[PDB]
């Protein structure tokens, strides 16, 4: 019987937001210590929660709903301080005209949808008739007055589709910053608690490899954008701006934002307003 140690099963978001990180994981050879799974953020969160992955990215709302069973990695996340560029509301009308109007939500999102609902309700005071559908701006603009998008589709609406067709594109990160002054965190990295307790060293090494790969990707952001631009409708300058506008930090100022967002949406989303976020503790 082969009872040798097994690589951690690690998730990775397929969107452009984590393409630089994938570059870093490959350049550092870290990928060869992982058994990697690429998918959308809602699927990767489902897999980690049910046990098909050991470590991976988790959209913030789903982490908070499972905070007792997950331990978040410090100092890396998918966030913003101001505009995030790839989490948007695309609207054919001013936001204050969306009361009772139909608004399409993308099923790939869990956190951005709730943030958009929080802003429209508590900041702008409109209660749209929401419905969820696959991310497809052209279809959404035919059936609804506004749509919430994330990932490459939102980035495409922001940088290309919106300007071409004269559609308003509201940046969810900017709207939150205007409303609260705070940065925002859309996804964190976490280990299953049972895996973190069974394999403390592998969990710590995976954490440190993510930080090393993240740091390298920010040093080589221009290389990453030049290569990625060859496969996208976005050009090199647009990708480099996107990669540098994203905020991958996860320290005290970012946890402050998570705390307040959880407090405002918890009682209407399925977790306590004062939910505890457990961070992976470093070695003494």
Ligand X SMILES: C=C(O[C@@H]1C=C(C(=O)O)C=C[C@H]1O)C(=O)O
Find tokens 């009361």 and name the residue.
99
Pick one of 9, 110, 156, 177: the residue that binds a second copy (CB under 8 A): 156
The reply on whether position 17 binds ligand X by CB under 6 A is yes
The stretch near a second copy (CB under 8 A) out of 31-39, 85-93, 175-183, 238-246 is 31-39
Sequence-ordered list of residues with C-beta below 8 angstroms from that of 137, at least 6 positions apart, any chain: 90, 147, 149, 153, 156, 157, 161
Pick one of 186, 248, 261, 271: the residue that binds ligand X (CB under 6 A): 186
The stretch near ligand X (CB under 6 A) out of 89-97, 103-111, 211-219, 247-255 is 103-111
The reply on whether position 232 binds a second copy by CB under 8 A is yes
Find which of ligand X, a second copy, none residue 121 binds, CB within 5 to 8 Å per kind.
none
Centroid of chain to Cα 134:
17
- Considering beta carbons, is residue 149 or 202 the nearer one to ligand X? 149
Q: Where are the beta strands (DSSP E) in 34-172?
A: 35-39, 55-59, 70-80, 87-91, 102-106, 129-133, 146-150, 168-171
Contact 184, 246 (CB under 8 A): no
Sequence-ordered list of residues with C-beta below 8 angstroms from that of 275, at least 6 positions apart, any chain: 64, 67, 262, 266
The reply on whether position 158 binds ligand X by CB under 6 A is no
* Number of other residues whose CB lies within 10 A of the CB of residue 12: 21
The reply on whether position 29 binds a second copy by CB under 8 A is yes
- DSSP per residue over 114-125, as a string? HHHHHIIIIII-
- Considering beta carbons, is residue 58 or 209 the nearer one to ligand X? 58
The reply on whether position 228 binds a second copy by CB under 8 A is yes
Angle 51-52-58 (CA atoms, 0-180°, nearest 5)?
80
Least distance in angstroms from the C-beta of 200 to ligand X: 27
The stretch near a second copy (CB under 8 A) out of 74-82, 97-105, 220-228, 254-262 is 220-228
The reply on whether position 86 binds ligand X by CB under 6 A is yes
Backbone angles phi, psi at 61, to 5 degrees: -60, -45
Residues of this chain that interact with ligand X (CB under 6 A) are 13, 15, 17, 41, 59, 78, 84, 86-87, 109-112, 150-151, 186-187
Residues of this chain that interact with a second copy (CB under 8 A) are 2-7, 19, 22-23, 25-27, 29, 31-33, 156, 223-224, 227-228, 230-233
């Amino acid at each position: 019987v082969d009872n040798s140690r097994t690589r951690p099963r690690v998730g990775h978001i397929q969107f452009l937001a984590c393409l630089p990180l994938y570059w870093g994981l490959a350049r550092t050879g870290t990928l060869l210590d992982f058994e990697l799974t690429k998918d959308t953020p809602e699927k990767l969160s489902e897999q980690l929660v049910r046990g098909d992955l050991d470590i991976g990215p988790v959209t913030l709302v789903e982490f908070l709903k499972n905070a007792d069973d997950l331990v978040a990695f410090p100092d890396i996340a998918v966030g913003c301080d101001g505009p995030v560029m790839s989490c948007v509301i695309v609207s054919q009308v001013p936001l204050d005209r969306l009361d009772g109007a139909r608004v399409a939500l993308g099923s790939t999102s869990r956190t951005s949808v709730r943030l958009a609902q929080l802003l429209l309700s508590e900041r702008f005071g409109v209660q749209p008739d929401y419905y969820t559908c696959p991310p497809d701006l052209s279809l959404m603009m035919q059936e609804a007055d506004a749509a919430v998008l994330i990932g490459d589709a939102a980035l495409r609406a922001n940088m290309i589709d919106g300007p071409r067709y004269g559609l308003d594109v509201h940046d969810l990160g900017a709207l939150w910053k205007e409303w609260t002054g705070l940065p925002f965190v859309f996804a964190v990295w976490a280990a299953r608690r049972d895996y973190a307790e069974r394999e403390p060293v592998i969990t710590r090494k995976v954490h440190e490899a993510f930080l090393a790969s993240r740091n390298l990707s920010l040093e080589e952001v221009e290389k990453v954008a030049e290569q990625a631009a060859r496969w996208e409708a976005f050009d090199e300058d647009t990708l480099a701006k996107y990669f540098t506008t994203l905020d991958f930090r996860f320290g005290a100022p970012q946890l402050e934002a998570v705390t307040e967002f959880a407090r405002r949406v918890g009682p209407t989303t399925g977790f306590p307003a004062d939910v505890k976020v457990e961070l992976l503790k470093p070695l003494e």
